[PDB]
Design a protein around this motif. Sequence first.
Motif, short mmCIF file in Angstrom:
data_model
loop_
_atom_site.label_atom_id
_atom_site.label_comp_id
_atom_site.label_asym_id
_atom_site.label_seq_id
_atom_site.Cartn_x
_atom_site.Cartn_y
_atom_site.Cartn_z
N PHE A 1 42.78 28.20 49.66
CA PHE A 1 42.23 29.55 49.70
C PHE A 1 42.48 30.21 48.35
CE2 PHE A 1 43.54 34.01 50.24
CZ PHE A 1 42.32 34.57 50.58
N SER A 2 43.68 30.02 47.81
CA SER A 2 44.01 30.51 46.47
C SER A 2 43.08 29.92 45.41
CB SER A 2 45.46 30.17 46.11
OG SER A 2 46.35 30.67 47.08
N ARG A 3 42.85 28.62 45.50
CA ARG A 3 41.98 27.93 44.55
C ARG A 3 40.55 28.50 44.62
NH1 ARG A 3 43.01 23.72 41.45
NH2 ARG A 3 41.30 22.37 40.72
N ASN A 4 40.01 28.58 45.83
CA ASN A 4 38.71 29.20 46.07
C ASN A 4 38.58 30.60 45.45
OD1 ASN A 4 37.22 27.27 47.40
ND2 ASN A 4 37.98 27.85 49.43
N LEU A 5 39.58 31.44 45.66
CA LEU A 5 39.51 32.81 45.14
C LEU A 5 39.42 32.81 43.61
CD1 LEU A 5 41.88 35.24 47.13
CD2 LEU A 5 39.40 34.99 47.24
N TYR A 6 40.16 31.92 42.96
CA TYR A 6 40.09 31.83 41.51
C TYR A 6 38.72 31.30 41.06
CZ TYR A 6 41.15 30.21 36.75
OH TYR A 6 41.12 29.96 35.39
N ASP A 7 38.27 30.21 41.67
CA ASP A 7 36.98 29.60 41.31
C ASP A 7 35.82 30.59 41.49
OD1 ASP A 7 38.44 27.29 40.90
OD2 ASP A 7 37.57 26.16 42.56
N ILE A 8 35.85 31.33 42.60
CA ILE A 8 34.88 32.40 42.82
C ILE A 8 35.04 33.49 41.76
CG2 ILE A 8 34.23 34.30 44.34
CD1 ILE A 8 34.84 32.46 46.68
N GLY A 9 36.27 33.93 41.53
CA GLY A 9 36.52 34.95 40.52
C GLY A 9 36.04 34.58 39.11
N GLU A 10 36.24 33.32 38.74
CA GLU A 10 35.79 32.79 37.45
C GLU A 10 34.27 32.90 37.22
OE1 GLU A 10 38.02 29.53 35.63
OE2 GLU A 10 37.48 31.13 34.21
N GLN A 11 33.50 32.87 38.30
CA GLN A 11 32.05 32.87 38.19
C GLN A 11 31.43 34.27 38.26
OE1 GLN A 11 30.51 30.21 37.41
NE2 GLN A 11 32.22 28.77 37.64
N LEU A 12 32.26 35.29 38.49
CA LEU A 12 31.76 36.67 38.55
C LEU A 12 31.81 37.34 37.17
CD1 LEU A 12 33.50 37.60 41.94
CD2 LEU A 12 31.05 37.27 41.53
N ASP A 13 30.67 37.78 36.64
CA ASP A 13 30.68 38.45 35.33
C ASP A 13 30.92 39.96 35.46
OD1 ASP A 13 28.23 39.60 36.12
OD2 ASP A 13 27.04 38.20 34.93
N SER A 14 30.90 40.66 34.33
CA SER A 14 31.33 42.06 34.33
C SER A 14 30.33 42.92 35.09
CB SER A 14 31.52 42.57 32.89
OG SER A 14 30.28 42.67 32.21
N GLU A 15 29.07 42.51 35.10
CA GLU A 15 28.05 43.19 35.89
C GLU A 15 28.29 43.04 37.42
OE1 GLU A 15 24.36 42.72 34.07
OE2 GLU A 15 23.15 43.67 35.64
N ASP A 16 28.61 41.83 37.87
CA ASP A 16 28.97 41.58 39.27
C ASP A 16 30.20 42.40 39.67
OD1 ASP A 16 26.94 39.65 39.70
OD2 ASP A 16 28.22 38.05 38.91
N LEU A 17 31.21 42.39 38.81
CA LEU A 17 32.44 43.13 39.09
C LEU A 17 32.19 44.62 39.31
CD1 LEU A 17 35.56 43.24 39.30
CD2 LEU A 17 35.57 43.57 36.81
N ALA A 18 31.38 45.22 38.43
CA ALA A 18 31.03 46.65 38.56
C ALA A 18 30.42 46.93 39.93
CB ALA A 18 30.07 47.06 37.45
N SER A 19 29.46 46.09 40.33
CA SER A 19 28.81 46.23 41.62
C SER A 19 29.80 46.06 42.76
CB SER A 19 27.68 45.20 41.74
OG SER A 19 26.84 45.24 40.60
N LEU A 20 30.67 45.05 42.64
CA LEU A 20 31.64 44.75 43.69
C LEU A 20 32.60 45.92 43.87
CD1 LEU A 20 32.40 40.99 42.92
CD2 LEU A 20 31.13 41.90 44.94
N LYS A 21 33.01 46.52 42.76
CA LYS A 21 33.93 47.66 42.81
C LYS A 21 33.25 48.85 43.49
CE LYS A 21 36.23 48.48 38.95
NZ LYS A 21 36.34 48.61 37.47
N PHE A 22 31.99 49.10 43.13
CA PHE A 22 31.22 50.20 43.73
C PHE A 22 31.10 50.03 45.25
CE2 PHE A 22 28.34 53.70 43.93
CZ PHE A 22 27.38 53.38 44.87
N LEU A 23 30.73 48.82 45.68
CA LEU A 23 30.52 48.55 47.11
C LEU A 23 31.82 48.63 47.89
CD1 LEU A 23 28.02 45.59 46.77
CD2 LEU A 23 27.46 47.86 47.64
N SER A 24 32.94 48.56 47.19
CA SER A 24 34.25 48.61 47.84
C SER A 24 34.85 50.02 47.89
CB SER A 24 35.23 47.68 47.12
OG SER A 24 34.92 46.33 47.35
N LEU A 25 34.06 51.03 47.53
CA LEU A 25 34.61 52.35 47.26
C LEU A 25 35.17 53.04 48.50
CD1 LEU A 25 32.30 53.83 44.51
CD2 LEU A 25 34.76 54.24 44.69
#
Lengths: 179, 179
Positions: free
Chosen positions: B2-26
């Motif tokens: 599960f830890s490995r998955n979270l990192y691998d997923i995190g590695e593939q998210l760019d700064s544009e994805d992150l901005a969106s993800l943060k907004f949707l988590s508000l």
Amino acid sequence: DFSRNLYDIGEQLDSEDLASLKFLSLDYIPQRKQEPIKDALMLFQRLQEKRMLEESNLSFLKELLFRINRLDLLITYLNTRKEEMERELQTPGRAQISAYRVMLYQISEEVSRSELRSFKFLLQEEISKCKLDDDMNLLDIFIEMEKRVILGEGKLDILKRVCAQINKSLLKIINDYEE
Amino acid sequence: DFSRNLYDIGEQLDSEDLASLKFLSLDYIPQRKQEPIKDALMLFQRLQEKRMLEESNLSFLKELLFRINRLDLLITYLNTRKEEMERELQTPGRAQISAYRVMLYQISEEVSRSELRSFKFLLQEEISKCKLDDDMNLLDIFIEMEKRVILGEGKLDILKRVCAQINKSLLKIINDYEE
């Protein structure tokens, strides 16, 4: 002859010169019209009407032309040199266009097109206290709109008002949501 | 794992994805911080901290990834297909990210870069009641500022405030005038 001069001078003024000339004339030829001045002859018509321009009174026209840097027209049609105008306008109380008006005009001329856009954003902020700039993304604005309690689940009015002015698909996104 | 998955997923998210993800988590991970979320792992860290993400609770992460259209990551790392997510989120009351939040995100994605700038000008007007657009020239603004009694011979403060933020030469024009 004076009539001929006014036309010849008017013919050489472009739409950028006219805008400046109208601005510099604001304390005499009032902002308020639904009879907008659309070329230089119309501007000269109104100056004559206000008795600030005639065959024997060229002083306001010469000052206008000097302040918008049409030294070519001054010497060609009014037989007037740069230094005549400087000496005239250096004498206290002799300038008819106020240093205030000239100052704003010179600002207008110094401002780059990107600087102008910054002026717009900076100006609006002084009035509205919402910070906006070219670099902000839409989501950060939404977040700010939500702190201003002008955006929310049951507060889509300002959003819809802005979006309807922009694009049909946008307002459709909003409307599709609402039921 | 599960830890490995979270990192691998995190590695593939760019700064544009992150901005969106943060907004949707508000509505869960509050706007308010001076500990800003600067990559996806930090976002996952906080979700775990709020007990909305763990080995046995992937539902919020899957919904985030679905809403930002990372169907690639859903199937590759979470063995989850588009239609599983649709069926899950079509069931009433099962979505954790509100349709309101998703709606603003989809607006964000539809807006062109020129449309965004129009959004800014149109938004400010709703609040300030001063009409501004990209096409206005500085002199017309001055004329408007003068009707708002925020600009004038002895009222150069707003002007100076805006100009000092823009360019040195500009504020010098103003200061040179003032005596």
